[PDB]
């Protein structure tokens, strides 16, 4: 079931969360035209292991072969880094990192725009981030997860985009993917009331085109069925007495770390 974190658990999650955010801050300058995703993966891994003295939660997970997930353009999620995949001007790329420190996980991701942005790419990234922020603002004890998924969907669809149904946010802590499943759309199947001490991620995947997706032969890579662009952002949070605290906040986030209701 849903694990409630103790204060000591939470302290450890703050550290892991900050470490993960830091990998994202760190990598920025390397994201340029001509770099391969395989190289980005190596830089991230070295940092995690050698500087942070932490470990990547992805390496070996269900056999995943790399340290982070890098998803370019039409890839929705779980893109596998490769020395042969080079970034080009206009690409939009998601880098999703999950670090383990002292047994606790920190999971977060953001989009990067390579070189000169395209109109669609910039728009898509912006809207996706805003959808995540909207959701964060709603988190508080007593509310049903359903309301959050419904809000994300309505926002996104109003902007002419679609939300991916298949992949979702999830509880996180000592475990990588714990209960509950955090859907990014309205579903009558969702019935979970939030309570303080719950820790989970919100990580909406939004497509420029239609919602349909397709899993590749590698068994990890997911792409949009219509080849439209897809974007995603993710944060790990903790439900507090009157709101929430964002554990993976970065310098570039424009939302406050602690959100309070009253
Ligand atoms: C190769 S497993 C990677 C899982 C992602 N961090 P998701 O946001 O749980
Ligand atoms: Co992630
Ligand atoms: Co996640
Ligand atoms: Na993408």
Swiss-Prot record:
The keyword Iron does not apply. GO terms for biological process: proteolysis. GO terms for cellular component: cytosol. Its cofactor is Co(2+); Zn(2+); Mn(2+); Fe(2+). It catalyses: Release of N-terminal amino acids, preferentially methionine, from peptides and arylamides. A divalent metal cation 1 binds at residues 96, 107, 234. It comes from the Bacteria. PROSITE patterns: MAP_1. Substrate binds at residues 78, 177. The keyword Metal-binding applies. Monomer. Belongs to the peptidase M24A family. Methionine aminopeptidase type 1 subfamily. Removes the N-terminal methionine from nascent proteins. The N-terminal methionine is often cleaved when the second residue in the primary sequence is small and uncharged (Met-Ala-, Cys, Gly, Pro, Ser, Thr, or Val). Requires deformylation of the N(alpha)-formylated initiator methionine before it can be hydrolyzed. This is Methionine aminopeptidase. It comes from Escherichia coli O157:H7.
């Amino acid at each position: 079931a849903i694990s409630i974190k103790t204060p000591e658990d939470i302290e450890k999650m703050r550290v892991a969360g900050r470490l993960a955010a830091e990998v994202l801050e760190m990598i920025e300058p390397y994201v340029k035209p001509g770099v391969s995703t395989g190289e980005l993966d190596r830089i991230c891994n070295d940092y995690i292991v050698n500087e942070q003295h932490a470990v990547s939660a992805c390496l070996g997970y269900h056999g995943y072969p790399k340290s982070v997930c890098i998803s370019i353009n039409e890839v929705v999620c779980h893109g596998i880094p490769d020395d042969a995949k080079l970034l080009k001007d206009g690409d939009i790329v998601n880098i999703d990192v999950t670090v383990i420190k002292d047994g606790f996980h920190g999971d977060t991701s953001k989009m990067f725009i390579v070189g000169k942005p395209t109109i669609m790419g910039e728009r898509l990234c912006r809207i996706t981030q805003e959808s995540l922020y909207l959701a964060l603002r709603m988190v508080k004890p007593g509310i049903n997860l359903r309301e959050i998924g419904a809000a994300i969907q309505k926002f996104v669809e109003a902007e002419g985009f679609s939300v991916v149904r298949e992949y979702c946010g999830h509880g996180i802590g000592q475990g990588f993917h714990e209960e509950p499943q955090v859907l990014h759309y309205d579903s009558r199947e969702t019935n979970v009331v939030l309570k303080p001490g719950m820790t989970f991620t919100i990580e909406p995947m939004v497509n420029a085109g239609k919602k349909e997706i397709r899993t590749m032969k590698d068994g990890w890579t997911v792409k949009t069925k219509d080849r439209s662009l897809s974007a995603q952002y993710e944060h790990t949070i903790v439900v507090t007495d009157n709101g929430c605290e964002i554990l993976t906040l970065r310098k570039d986030d424009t939302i406050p770390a602690i959100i309070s209701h009253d």
